């Protein structure tokens, strides 16, 4: 099996810059058999470059390909926001057919701190026996963020579900949801719940709390 | 002009068997080799099987050989994939791709069809409405939420006010935890619009014939 | 089936180049240009080449590489109802072996005759000459040139034979030469393509060394440009006459030898994923390119003959063995260092033929080694016995009247037989196996299907291209005669049996096993039209 390794795995770029990604094969591949596919977040793959250098129909001229043997590369001349996607190389010269591990191209934007919002358990859920307090951390950049839960003053590390969104296609931001789940008894046996968010934009964390009275 | 449509496939118990289909239109189907390519939930592309124009040459991936059978119907322009003794590793979205010329690649892909192989049991989601807590207000916009908890399998579809409200919504992708999916979504609107106008969460889980609406009220 | 493979790819390319490029590239193509409008002849020649020749050439190369078996086994596995095609193709190759090598012997005989200070065929005052000898070629039937009389009265001794009945004595100098060619063929096709594919290095490349030397020598002779004029100067009036289109069509078919059984055998040792399409286009071009280059070598000396030696161009712009054994040696014997030109020229003729002999013989050896394992196990023995039958029967062509016998085979061994054989090959491939089923096989080898151009040519043009030949070949038919000799009507029949002994295998085998399988009429017309691989 001819495994194709792509690097980098993720890479950010500001519109206008030049982008290059590489596809290294574990066995020599005929140049006429190396292809590249573009897959946008949520859609299916689309043939992008075939025979190393040939642009598929509809592919703008700012895309180029090159390489041979075991080293190939896809290169964007001046990257545009509509180029944010995952790029897969693929060899068609030997069975089994093998796709590369892919390079995810994300857009670079200015830093943005998140707008946090804390939500106590729904009344419907409290009667079903459980209690989930969710917390949204919306429209921030860069993607890495860190959430922390505190019940009263003690921090709670267990029973959390975090989810990230794909990079937004309009403002290039990220958003992240985090849900803390406890039993109704455990929940009603405490007073204040706190959602602390740590992010590169701030020296100290953004906090949002609420007491089970107001 | 060329169209490929995958179909069939959903939840299947391990060891079970299921059959996928691909409908071809817009070209002389009988002249092109076809392949199935799947994409695991970890988003990795993996080729599975290829069948030649007249079905006389068939290649299989090592990880699938002996269990999957690729077949062709040039009369009705349909591609099939017969799967047996399935395992969880086979869980993926199965793509149907056209690729006659090895030197040109897979020039057309279908929309995909999802196969979930799991011994978990289908369950409907509890849909809870998320409304802020009495406090600050004093902002141009406020944000609401909707919690879809403990369902299976994928997918569920979530909209706000039946689709009229779209700007300012973040529906976070679902996360599996101990055989149950949880999923949340947030909307933000100017204070002059809520609770002035009514804002409602519309969840849909066809796997469990669920269809619920939850109006967000600030009790 | 752990079939062996060409030690290197050049072994295959040179083996194909060698089989294709033979004396016909020298003693027929340039003549056809000079006769059919010079440069204008390239119009119908290139069209017939692109539309009939290279398609069929490409087809058999792909079949051989894909089905990986000799001619008999291949067509059997392709459509059983037409397995006889493989038998006809092997028998035809067998017959032409009885006369193709004696022309190589003539080349060695003249080669050994050139080890002298003054070439024998120069003057008209030898024991073999007649009072009607003249120094160079003329246009009166009873007055031959010095070189003509040498070839006729000394080498062949054909003057002492009254026809095919009167054969006469066995010229043991020719028999010795014939043996030296079968000995060369033996220790070449001796242990398979392991050595075959290497001997082809010298035999396929050496002719280009000599063509290069003779090309410089000829173009630097007084009057050579005049020859190039008779060779090429266009006269597109010839394009209008249908005699030049059948001339082009026929030369293109017989110069590539598509469907003769050897391209199949040669390709059957390629690796399954070899780009045989790139091979067919490469070698087919090198073949025609070699004919073009050769025309300059010939007519440069032809113009020299007509300008310094004072002869009519029509009297020396001949074709066939007369051009290489009479006209050209005469000019060689008239230039400084003649002994050198004569020695490398006759050596070129030899190596031009050997390649093509190898191919015809391999077609037989491979086809049988793939259908009867007794032969495959004892290769060295089989060819030993084959060549021996060739040589022994070949002694009848080392006789004094051998030409009459050899001339008979030339006009009947493969003349119409191979045409009807390839016609069924094209019909079987495109219409009974299927062009889509065939294009699918090529896709699996080279990764892409043949274009619609190649499919249209295999399905409609190729059968018309081959009928266009066979029809006009039957229309121009006239009884067999050499000079004043009229062959007796029993000889004229002997040739038709040789012609039929191959073609009959097609309907004969189609009748035999059409009854050897059990079932209904349609149930058997389908058990015999289902390919072998479509059974697993
Ligand atoms: C004096 C000597 C050198 C004459 C040599 C002439 C041939 C070498 C040239 C003349 C016409 C050419 C042909 C013109 C047209 C084509 C069609 C072409 O078909 C294609 O469309 C290729 C792509 C495809 O259909 O797959 C293949 C090459 C071919 C046969 C060419 C092959 C080379 C040919 C025979
Ligand atoms: C390396 C191993 C080679 C294998 C052996 C070669 C086999 C070829 C034998 C041909 O026979 C000879 O041919 C010569 C060709 O001409 C004749 O010379 C004839 O012509 C000569 C001039 O060319 C004259 O000098 C001679 O007297 C006259 O016999 C000669 O008689 C004859 O026996
Ligand atoms: C004007 C004339 C005499 C020029 C002679 C041209 C000669 C040199 C040409 C004609 C045929 C050509 C050969 C055709 C086939 C191949 C296979 C290729 O993979 C290696 C080169 C090789 C071996 C070529 C070498 C050069 C060649 C021999
Ligand atoms: N062009 C090759 C030549 O016509 C030829 C030589 C030997 C053969 O056995 C044959 O069938 C054809
Ligand atoms: Cl030719
Ligand atoms: Na030829
Ligand atoms: Na030859």
Residue numbers in the entry:
A (entry chain L): 1 to 214
B (entry chain H): 1 to 219
C (entry chain A): 25 to 161, 203 to 601
What text comes from the article?
Neurotransmitter transporters of the solute carrier 6 (SLC6) family enforce spatiotemporal control of neurotransmitter levels in the synaptic space through Na+/Cl−-coupled uptake in the central and peripheral nervous systems.
The subsite B residues in dDAT differ from hNET and hDAT at two positions, D121G (TM3) and S426M (TM8). In order to evaluate whether hNET-like substitutions in the subsite B of dDAT would influence and shift the conformation of NE to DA-like pose, we crystallized NE in complex with dDATNET construct that has D121G and S426M substitutions, alongside F471L. Despite absence of the D121 sidechain, the para-OH group of NE establishes interactions with the main-chain carbonyl oxygen of A117. This construct, hereafter, referred to as dDATNET closely resembles the binding propensities of monoamine transport inhibitors with hNET than with hDAT. The catechol group of NE is observed to interact primarily at subsite C in the vicinity of NET-specific residues A117 and A428. The binding of NE displaces water molecules in the binding pocket observed in the substrate-free state and does not induce any local conformational changes in the binding, contrary to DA.
